[PDB]
Amino acid sequence: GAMAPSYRVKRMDIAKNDEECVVNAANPRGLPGDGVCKAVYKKWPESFKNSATPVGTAKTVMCGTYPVIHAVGPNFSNYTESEGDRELAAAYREVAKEVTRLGVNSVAIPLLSTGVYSGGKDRLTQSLNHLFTAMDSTDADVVIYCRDKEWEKKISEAIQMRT
Ligand SMILES: O=C1NCCN[C@@H]1CC1CCCCC1
Numbered sequence: 001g002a003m004a005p006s007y008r009v010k011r012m013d014i015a016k017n018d019e020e021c022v023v024n025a026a027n028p029r030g031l032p033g034d035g036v037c038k039a040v041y042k043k044w045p046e047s048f049k050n051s052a053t054p055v056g057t058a059k060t061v062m063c064g065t066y067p068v069i070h071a072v073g074p075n076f077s078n079y080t081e082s083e084g085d086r087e088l089a090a091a092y093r094e095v096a097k098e099v100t101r102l103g104v105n106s107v108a109i110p111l112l113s114t115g116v117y118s119g120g121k122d123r124l125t126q127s128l129n130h131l132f133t134a135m136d137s138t139d140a141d142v143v144i145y146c147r148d149k150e151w152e153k154k155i156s157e158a159i160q161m162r163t
């Protein structure tokens with residue numbers, strides 16, 4: 001565990017993370033994909049061997065000894081708000097199980113079901129609150145990665161608000 005488990009946010013490419021493992025915002029088919037998933041495929045392509053997994057699940061594949069946790073959030077273009085909300089919560093619960101099982105002291109994580117799976121809606125608060133619900137009972141240092149300047153400020157505010 002971390003000596004004083006924390007949450008932090010950085011605005012940069014998650015492929016450059018300084019953590020003991022990474023969460024990929026994966027598609028269900030283990031394809032290279034776009035955005036975070038494409039950055040992850042360029043950096044850790046070996047981790048896409050048998051990485052396909054259903055929506056609302058996470059599947060870890062090692063790139064050497066570096067664990068890549070493929071977490072499949074719902075595409076809100078296809079899911080109802082209700083059913084998508086349930087699957088997004090579930091994906092983060094499976095991430096917390098994997099982080100625990102791996103025994104890492106730190107994890108780099110993106111906000112799932114944002115970007116091209118958002119169905120054109122701002123889901124910062126929805127996705128971040130499901131991340132906290134899952135990760136708050138773990139003792140890993142969590143480092144959230146984002147690309148937008150305004151999102152960085154809002155995520156940082158939400159972290160600082162809880163203290
Ligand atoms: O998921 C995102 N991350 C950074 C901001 N851009 C998208 C969400 C936007 C979709 C279109 C309408 C406005 C919100």
Ligand SMILES: [Cl-]
Nearest residue numbers: 011012013016
């Ligand atoms: Cl960068």
Ligand SMILES: [Cl-]
Nearest residue numbers: 146147148151
């Ligand atoms: Cl972002």
